[PDB]
Amino acid sequence: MQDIDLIMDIPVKLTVELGRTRMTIKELLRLTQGSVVALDGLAGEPLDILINGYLIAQGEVVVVADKYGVRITDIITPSERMRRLSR
Amino acid sequence: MQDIDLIMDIPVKLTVELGRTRMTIKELLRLTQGSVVALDGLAGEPLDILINGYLIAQGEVVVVADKYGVRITDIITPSERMRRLSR
Amino acid sequence: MQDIDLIMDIPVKLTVELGRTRMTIKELLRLTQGSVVALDGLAGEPLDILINGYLIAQGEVVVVADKYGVRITDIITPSERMRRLSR
Amino acid sequence: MQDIDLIMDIPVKLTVELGRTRMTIKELLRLTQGSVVALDGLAGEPLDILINGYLIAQGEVVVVADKYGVRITDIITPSERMRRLSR
Amino acid sequence: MQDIDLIMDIPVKLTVELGRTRMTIKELLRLTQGSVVALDGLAGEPLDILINGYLIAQGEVVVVADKYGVRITDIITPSERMRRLSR
Amino acid sequence: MQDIDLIMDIPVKLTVELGRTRMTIKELLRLTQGSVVALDGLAGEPLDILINGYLIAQGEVVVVADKYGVRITDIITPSERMRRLSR
Amino acid sequence: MADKELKFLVVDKFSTMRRIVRNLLKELGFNNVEEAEDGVDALNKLQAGGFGFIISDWNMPNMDGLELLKTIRADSAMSALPVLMVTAEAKKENIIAAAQAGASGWVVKPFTAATLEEKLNKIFEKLGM
Amino acid sequence: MADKELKFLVVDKFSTMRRIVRNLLKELGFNNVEEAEDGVDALNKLQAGGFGFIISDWNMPNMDGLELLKTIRADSAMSALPVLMVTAEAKKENIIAAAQAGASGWVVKPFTAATLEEKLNKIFEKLGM
Amino acid sequence: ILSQAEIDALLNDIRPYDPNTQRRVVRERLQALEIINERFARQFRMGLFNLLRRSPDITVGAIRIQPYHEFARNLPVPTNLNLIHLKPLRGTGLVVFSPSLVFIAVDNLFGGDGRFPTKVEGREFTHTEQRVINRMLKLALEGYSDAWKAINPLEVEYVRSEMQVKFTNITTSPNDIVVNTPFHVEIGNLTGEFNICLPFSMIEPLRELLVNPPLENSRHEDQNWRDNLVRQVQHSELELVANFADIPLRLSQILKLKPGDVLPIEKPDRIIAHVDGVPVLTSQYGTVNGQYALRVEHLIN
């Protein structure tokens, strides 16, 4: 696991996405202050967790002492990998 | 190997640095188009290879068919690691 | 100009990057002495100039009397910056 | 220990740092009289103790009869050396 | 040796003094560009070597490849120590 | 001018430093008679001029009739001072 | 590699052409170059000695390149001295006559620096220099 | 090292050249220098004696350098006196004639102080001074 | 015509410091001086072509830097030495004309075919030769002044003429460092040379200006470039470090430090914030939102 620790010694960035949606640019131009945009994800569903833009897990939003937090729920595996690929 | 594959399914960015130097902001303001800045590294020395800003190896510049390339020479190694951190 | 001088009395570090590339950790482990790594930047393209890790300009490699040098070519500008970001 | 006493006979300066933080120069220019800057260290954590700019120990703030004081808590060792290096 | 290593992991500054002399402030004000000031040390005598302002040895000036250098000659020694303190 | 004369009626000591360098105590113990120590200042650069340990000007070494002398070249100035400090 | 201190004698009726040849030789690393206006002056300077290579024009006043080459070859002390012939017209008869006289090379005006360098390299390789 | 009190006789038809040579000798540490305008005056001063070195020009009125050197060598009391020859034109025939006459050295105008110092050092080494 | 070597053939990292060397030498290349010399060279070539009705070839040699005594020792004698002043810089410059170049110019001006070179006999230059040297020097000074305009406008003024180096007195000491730029001039089959020697102290104030190879700038394009560069740099991050106080101690006391040991320090009225060791401001310390905070009082100007 020497090479494993070697690579682990690299800082990386984690990204949590609230949701995804598709819209036309005309609709984007119709958006002003106070405009409302709906997301394709249902309310309460676990949010996507991304490492450098790569989805690796899903989590739920929590509040920690005055700060937002993500509760790790479930990872991926080629099954989910393919599942989300198809999804 | 299982964790090795799990982290293998992740994209990362590699960075090659030509050299490092220290200068004052006044000197930076004195720089215009065509100005010359010297680097602390000697000409021909292997260039630092960084993963997400972390130095892990050194390499030499080569040209590949019309593209720049870096020839892997040697790993960073930890005594040199502390030494460069101290630098 | 007063604030300009106040911040002028500060030293900062300038960083020039040869190029950027993405590879898997398995490929990194497959790298030994003499291994070859290709960069995403074409040979001859101006190299990225960074201040404390922030890209602000681009330059070309020159040799000054026995030392490497970077010839200032053009500022980063917003569009090129956003393009590199999307990259 | 003759050479040891020989070198000990040299006055040296000790420096205690309240905390460290990173900010942009624009934010520094936005700072005026009464401005507030947050530090990366949690309130109550032992403060870094430096000898000629070299971190060798950590301590806690105390008041001695009308003067500030630092209570020595814990030193370093390559483990903490590397630990803070990684930290 | 343990304490020797513990203090070895510390950077210190070394100072070499060309010579010492005493003069009045009026004479200092009489000094302009091109003025000549004599030193109490004879030409060719080894120069004082100081660590953080503490005299510990004496050395001779040499030129190394394009750089000034000091050739270690003899330690300060304590009888001479008191004598110079008295001077 | 009155206060100028009042402080003029005072003797002060002027100190000229050949150069500065940093080394470990182990390296200092490795120094014997005839040992060579390099200085961080380039050969020929003007030497630091200090009043009671305070750097106020720079000068060049000259020989006066059988005695060493320092030729006043330029005052310390704030920027060069801060630069030496950061050094 | 050929000796960079080799002495070159450039013979031509035009001073500008001689200067051009001298500059081309300097760009090739040869700095010991002397100039001659005609065959008579070239022979007079050759009698001084010390030359290792000759670049001469074909048509020159009071002595042409062929006669100068024949005189050089007739002299025992200079029979082995290489001579480079530069001409404006590459007539076959003149080239054959020069080859029979012992010409080391042939250059046709106008020419490039690459051609001159190639001719010099070939002559040096033939002489083992 | 050569004796710094050695007496030098500088012979030249131009006073400015003689002054230049005297100053160059003074910069080299030789202060006993006398000047002669031609070969006749040089021989007359040599008959006085006390000179240890001679620097003479080649072309001088009423006596050239070669005749002066021949006269010096023909004199038993001065046959071993070193003579330095300075000329404006270094013709091979003149140099050979001077060497046959017994010239200790040869300098060609214009020259630098380094060349003169080198010639003097070589002459002194040959004479064991 | 036998050279000196032919005449001879036929006839036969630690260094001690000398304080008499004035080691203030520029190990950096003076490109700008090279560009000025090239421009001067071309402008003079033209002037010589106009004056002599012949096309001259002027080659700029390497800019060798050496002590003044070495430069004097390598000057052929006799020679035409001209003292010039480069206003507003302080000092006296030298324009050295070799006798061969003077003789070639005299030959060309007075109908000389160039087939009979004049051998230097060591005589003084005549009044007509002096006037010719005058004209050549005026052309050279005009070319030099025009060449220096692009980098730093300087006025070149002739002072006096000398034939021996001892009378120049352009340097305080023989060991002083001077900058000499040799030039080679070829006219037909005749070759001449001249040298421009400048003491380093004269050009020492312009050291930075001489260093980099500079040219082709602007006033408004450069203004916009500088403004945008200033805007871009403002986004860079810095590490702000605040020191609580400083304690003067000894290394022995450091070795005796143990958990619980209390070190007395002077209470600071203000906290100084340092960026890479450079103080930038003074402030009071406090706690805001559960973190240590600094209340800025003054900015170090």
Side-chain angles (χ1 to χ4, degrees), chain H residues 13-14 16 19-20 23 88-90 92 95 99 106-109 111-114 117 119 126, chain I residues 1-2 4 7-8 10-12 73-78 119-124 163-164 166:
Chain H
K13 55 182 178 178
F14 294 111
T16 303
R19 181 181 58 181
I20 291 180
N23 279 268
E89 188 175 11
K92 182 178 181 179
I95 297 168
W106 193 273
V107 187
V108 182
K109 302 179 182 181
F111 61 95
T112 63
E117 183 180 3
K119 295 300 180 178
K126 289 187 176 182
Chain I
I1 300 181
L2 306 176
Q4 212 75 5
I7 297 172
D8 300 332
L10 277 186
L11 290 181
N12 299 329
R73 190 171 176 263
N74 299 331
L75 288 180
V77 294
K119 285 120 295 183
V120 187
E121 299 181 60
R123 64 169 183 83
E124 301 183 2
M163 298 180 302
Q164 304 194 42
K166 54 166 182 169

Coordinates of all heavy atoms in Angstrom, one line a residue, chain H residues 13-14 16 19-20 23 88-90 92 95 99 106-109 111-114 117 119 126, chain I residues 1-2 4 7-8 10-12 73-78 119-124 163-164 166:
Chain H
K13 N 64.8 58.2 -35.6 CA 64.8 59.5 -36.2 C 63.7 60.4 -35.7 O 63.7 61.6 -35.9 CB 64.7 59.3 -37.7 CG 63.5 58.5 -38.2 CD 63.6 58.4 -39.7 CE 62.4 57.6 -40.2 NZ 62.4 57.4 -41.7
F14 N 62.6 59.9 -35.1 CA 61.5 60.7 -34.6 C 61.6 60.8 -33.0 O 61.8 59.8 -32.3 CB 60.2 60.0 -34.9 CG 59.9 60.0 -36.4 CD1 59.9 58.9 -37.1 CD2 59.7 61.2 -37.1 CE1 59.6 58.8 -38.5 CE2 59.4 61.2 -38.4 CZ 59.4 60.0 -39.1
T16 N 59.3 61.9 -31.0 CA 58.1 61.4 -30.3 C 58.2 59.9 -30.1 O 57.8 59.4 -29.0 CB 56.8 61.7 -31.2 OG1 56.8 63.2 -31.3 CG2 55.6 61.3 -30.5
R19 N 60.5 59.2 -27.2 CA 59.8 59.5 -25.9 C 58.8 58.4 -25.6 O 58.7 58.0 -24.4 CB 59.1 60.9 -26.0 CG 58.4 61.3 -24.7 CD 57.7 62.6 -24.9 NE 56.7 62.6 -26.0 CZ 55.9 63.6 -26.3 NH1 56.0 64.8 -25.7 NH2 55.1 63.5 -27.3
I20 N 58.1 57.9 -26.6 CA 57.1 56.8 -26.3 C 57.9 55.6 -25.8 O 57.5 54.9 -24.8 CB 56.3 56.5 -27.6 CG1 55.4 57.6 -27.9 CG2 55.5 55.2 -27.4 CD1 54.5 57.4 -29.1
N23 N 59.0 56.1 -22.2 CA 57.9 56.0 -21.3 C 57.6 54.5 -21.1 O 57.3 54.1 -20.0 CB 56.7 56.8 -21.7 CG 56.9 58.3 -21.4 OD1 56.4 58.7 -20.3 ND2 57.5 59.0 -22.2
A88 N 59.2 49.6 -39.5 CA 57.8 49.9 -39.9 C 57.4 48.8 -41.0 O 56.2 48.6 -41.1 CB 57.7 51.3 -40.6
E89 N 58.3 48.2 -41.7 CA 58.0 47.2 -42.6 C 58.8 45.9 -42.3 O 60.0 46.0 -42.3 CB 58.2 47.6 -44.1 CG 57.7 46.7 -45.1 CD 57.8 47.2 -46.5 OE1 58.5 48.3 -46.7 OE2 57.3 46.6 -47.5
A90 N 58.2 44.8 -42.2 CA 58.8 43.6 -41.8 C 59.1 42.7 -43.1 O 58.5 41.6 -43.3 CB 58.1 42.8 -40.8
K92 N 61.0 40.2 -45.3 CA 61.8 38.9 -45.0 C 63.3 39.1 -45.2 O 64.1 38.6 -44.4 CB 61.2 37.8 -45.8 CG 61.9 36.4 -45.4 CD 61.3 35.3 -46.2 CE 61.9 34.0 -45.9 NZ 61.3 32.8 -46.6
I95 N 64.8 41.1 -42.4 CA 64.9 40.4 -41.2 C 66.0 39.3 -41.2 O 66.7 39.1 -40.3 CB 63.5 39.7 -40.9 CG1 62.4 40.8 -40.7 CG2 63.6 38.8 -39.7 CD1 61.0 40.2 -40.7
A99 N 69.2 39.2 -38.8 CA 69.6 38.0 -38.1 C 71.0 37.5 -38.4 O 71.7 37.1 -37.5 CB 68.6 36.9 -38.4
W106 N 63.3 41.6 -32.8 CA 62.7 42.3 -33.9 C 61.3 42.8 -33.4 O 60.5 41.9 -32.9 CB 62.6 41.5 -35.1 CG 62.3 42.2 -36.4 CD1 61.0 42.5 -36.8 CD2 63.2 42.8 -37.3 NE1 61.1 43.2 -38.0 CE2 62.4 43.4 -38.3 CE3 64.6 42.9 -37.4 CZ2 63.0 44.1 -39.4 CZ3 65.1 43.6 -38.5 CH2 64.3 44.2 -39.4
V107 N 61.0 44.0 -33.6 CA 59.7 44.6 -33.3 C 59.2 45.3 -34.6 O 59.9 46.0 -35.3 CB 59.7 45.5 -32.1 CG1 58.3 46.0 -31.7 CG2 60.4 44.9 -30.9
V108 N 57.9 45.2 -34.8 CA 57.2 45.8 -36.0 C 56.3 46.9 -35.6 O 55.4 46.6 -34.8 CB 56.5 44.7 -36.9 CG1 56.0 45.4 -38.1 CG2 57.5 43.6 -37.2
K109 N 56.5 48.1 -36.1 CA 55.5 49.2 -35.8 C 54.2 48.9 -36.6 O 54.3 48.5 -37.8 CB 56.1 50.5 -36.2 CG 57.4 50.9 -35.4 CD 57.9 52.2 -35.9 CE 59.2 52.5 -35.2 NZ 59.8 53.9 -35.6
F111 N 53.1 48.6 -32.4 CA 53.2 47.5 -31.5 C 52.6 47.9 -30.1 O 52.4 49.1 -29.9 CB 54.6 46.9 -31.3 CG 55.6 48.0 -30.7 CD1 55.8 48.1 -29.4 CD2 56.2 48.9 -31.6 CE1 56.7 49.0 -28.9 CE2 57.1 49.8 -31.1 CZ 57.3 49.9 -29.8
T112 N 52.3 47.0 -29.3 CA 51.8 47.2 -28.0 C 52.9 47.1 -26.9 O 53.9 46.5 -27.2 CB 50.6 46.3 -27.6 OG1 51.1 45.0 -27.6 CG2 49.5 46.4 -28.7
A113 N 52.6 47.6 -25.7 CA 53.5 47.5 -24.6 C 53.7 46.0 -24.2 O 54.8 45.6 -23.8 CB 53.0 48.3 -23.4
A114 N 52.7 45.2 -24.4 CA 52.8 43.8 -24.1 C 53.8 43.1 -25.0 O 54.6 42.3 -24.5 CB 51.5 43.1 -24.2
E117 N 57.3 44.2 -23.9 CA 57.7 43.5 -22.7 C 58.1 42.0 -23.0 O 59.0 41.5 -22.4 CB 56.6 43.6 -21.7 CG 56.9 42.9 -20.3 CD 55.8 43.0 -19.4 OE1 54.7 43.6 -19.7 OE2 55.9 42.6 -18.2
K119 N 59.2 40.8 -25.8 CA 60.5 40.7 -26.5 C 61.6 40.9 -25.6 O 62.7 40.2 -25.6 CB 60.5 41.8 -27.6 CG 59.5 41.5 -28.7 CD 59.8 40.2 -29.4 CE 58.8 40.0 -30.6 NZ 59.0 38.7 -31.3
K126 N 67.3 34.7 -23.0 CA 68.3 34.2 -23.9 C 69.7 34.5 -23.4 O 70.7 33.7 -23.5 CB 68.2 34.6 -25.3 CG 67.0 34.0 -26.1 CD 66.9 34.4 -27.5 CE 65.8 33.7 -28.2 NZ 65.8 34.0 -29.7
Chain I
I1 N 55.7 40.0 -46.2 CA 55.6 40.7 -44.9 C 55.3 39.8 -43.8 O 54.2 39.2 -43.7 CB 54.5 41.8 -45.0 CG1 54.8 42.8 -46.1 CG2 54.4 42.6 -43.7 CD1 53.8 43.9 -46.3
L2 N 56.3 39.5 -43.0 CA 56.2 38.5 -42.0 C 55.5 39.0 -40.7 O 55.8 40.1 -40.3 CB 57.6 38.0 -41.6 CG 58.5 37.5 -42.8 CD1 59.9 37.1 -42.3 CD2 57.8 36.3 -43.5
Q4 N 54.6 38.7 -36.6 CA 55.4 38.6 -35.4 C 55.8 37.1 -35.1 O 56.9 36.8 -34.8 CB 54.8 39.2 -34.2 CG 55.8 39.9 -33.2 CD 56.4 41.1 -33.7 OE1 56.0 41.7 -34.8 NE2 57.4 41.7 -33.0
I7 N 58.3 35.9 -37.6 CA 59.6 36.5 -37.3 C 60.2 35.7 -36.2 O 61.4 35.4 -36.2 CB 59.5 38.0 -37.0 CG1 59.0 38.7 -38.2 CG2 60.8 38.5 -36.5 CD1 58.7 40.2 -37.9
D8 N 59.4 35.4 -35.1 CA 60.0 34.6 -34.0 C 60.4 33.2 -34.5 O 61.4 32.6 -34.1 CB 58.9 34.4 -32.9 CG 58.5 35.8 -32.4 OD1 59.4 36.7 -32.4 OD2 57.4 35.9 -31.9
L10 N 61.4 32.3 -37.5 CA 62.6 32.4 -38.3 C 63.8 32.7 -37.5 O 64.9 32.1 -37.7 CB 62.4 33.4 -39.4 CG 61.7 33.0 -40.7 CD1 61.7 34.0 -41.8 CD2 62.3 31.7 -41.2
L11 N 63.7 33.6 -36.5 CA 64.8 33.9 -35.7 C 65.2 32.7 -34.8 O 66.5 32.5 -34.7 CB 64.5 35.1 -34.8 CG 64.3 36.5 -35.5 CD1 64.0 37.6 -34.5 CD2 65.6 36.8 -36.2
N12 N 64.3 32.0 -34.3 CA 64.6 30.8 -33.5 C 64.9 29.6 -34.4 O 64.0 29.1 -35.1 CB 63.4 30.5 -32.5 CG 63.1 31.6 -31.6 OD1 64.0 32.4 -31.2 ND2 61.8 31.8 -31.2
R73 N 47.5 48.5 -21.9 CA 48.6 47.6 -22.3 C 48.4 47.0 -23.7 O 49.4 46.6 -24.3 CB 48.8 46.5 -21.3 CG 50.0 45.7 -21.4 CD 50.2 44.8 -20.2 NE 51.4 43.9 -20.3 CZ 51.3 42.6 -20.8 NH1 50.2 42.1 -21.1 NH2 52.4 41.9 -20.8
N74 N 47.2 46.9 -24.2 CA 46.9 46.3 -25.5 C 46.6 47.3 -26.6 O 46.1 46.9 -27.6 CB 45.7 45.3 -25.3 CG 45.9 44.2 -24.3 OD1 47.0 43.8 -24.2 ND2 44.8 43.7 -23.7
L75 N 46.9 48.6 -26.3 CA 46.7 49.6 -27.3 C 48.0 49.8 -28.1 O 49.1 50.1 -27.5 CB 46.3 50.9 -26.7 CG 44.9 51.0 -26.2 CD1 44.6 52.4 -25.6 CD2 43.9 50.7 -27.3
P76 N 48.0 49.6 -29.4 CA 49.3 49.8 -30.2 C 49.7 51.2 -30.1 O 48.9 52.2 -30.1 CB 48.8 49.4 -31.6 CG 47.7 48.5 -31.5 CD 46.9 49.0 -30.3
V77 N 51.0 51.4 -30.1 CA 51.6 52.8 -30.0 C 52.5 53.0 -31.3 O 53.2 52.1 -31.7 CB 52.3 53.0 -28.7 CG1 51.4 52.9 -27.5 CG2 53.4 52.0 -28.6
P78 N 52.5 54.3 -31.8 CA 51.6 55.4 -31.4 C 50.2 55.3 -31.9 O 50.0 54.5 -32.8 CB 52.4 56.6 -32.1 CG 53.0 56.0 -33.4 CD 53.4 54.6 -32.9
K119 N 53.2 52.5 -44.2 CA 53.6 51.9 -43.0 C 53.9 52.9 -41.9 O 54.4 54.0 -42.2 CB 54.9 51.1 -43.2 CG 54.7 49.8 -44.0 CD 55.5 49.7 -45.3 CE 55.0 50.7 -46.3 NZ 55.7 50.6 -47.6
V120 N 53.4 52.6 -40.7 CA 53.5 53.6 -39.6 C 54.9 53.7 -39.2 O 55.6 52.8 -38.7 CB 52.6 53.1 -38.4 CG1 52.5 54.2 -37.4 CG2 51.2 52.8 -38.9
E121 N 55.4 54.9 -39.2 CA 56.9 55.2 -38.9 C 57.0 55.6 -37.4 O 58.1 55.8 -37.0 CB 57.5 56.2 -39.8 CG 57.5 55.8 -41.3 CD 58.1 56.8 -42.2 OE1 59.3 57.1 -42.0 OE2 57.4 57.3 -43.1
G122 N 55.9 55.8 -36.7 CA 55.9 56.4 -35.4 C 55.9 57.9 -35.3 O 56.2 58.4 -34.2
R123 N 55.6 58.6 -36.4 CA 55.7 60.0 -36.4 C 54.3 60.6 -36.0 O 53.3 59.9 -36.0 CB 56.0 60.5 -37.8 CG 55.0 60.2 -38.9 CD 55.2 60.9 -40.2 NE 54.2 60.6 -41.2 CZ 53.0 61.2 -41.2 NH1 52.6 62.2 -40.3 NH2 52.1 60.9 -42.2
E124 N 54.3 61.9 -35.6 CA 53.1 62.5 -35.2 C 52.3 62.8 -36.5 O 52.8 63.1 -37.6 CB 53.4 63.8 -34.5 CG 54.2 63.7 -33.2 CD 54.4 65.0 -32.5 OE1 53.9 66.0 -32.9 OE2 55.1 64.9 -31.4
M163 N 48.2 61.4 -28.0 CA 48.9 60.3 -28.7 C 49.4 59.3 -27.8 O 49.8 58.2 -28.3 CB 50.1 60.9 -29.5 CG 49.7 61.9 -30.6 SD 51.1 62.5 -31.6 CE 52.1 63.2 -30.3
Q164 N 49.4 59.5 -26.5 CA 49.9 58.5 -25.5 C 48.8 58.3 -24.5 O 48.1 59.2 -24.1 CB 51.2 58.9 -24.9 CG 52.3 59.2 -25.9 CD 53.7 59.3 -25.2 OE1 54.0 58.5 -24.3 NE2 54.5 60.3 -25.7
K166 N 49.1 57.6 -21.3 CA 49.4 58.2 -20.0 C 48.8 59.6 -19.9 O 48.4 60.0 -18.7 CB 50.9 58.3 -19.8 CG 51.6 59.0 -20.9 CD 53.1 59.4 -20.5 CE 53.8 60.2 -21.6 NZ 55.0 60.8 -21.2

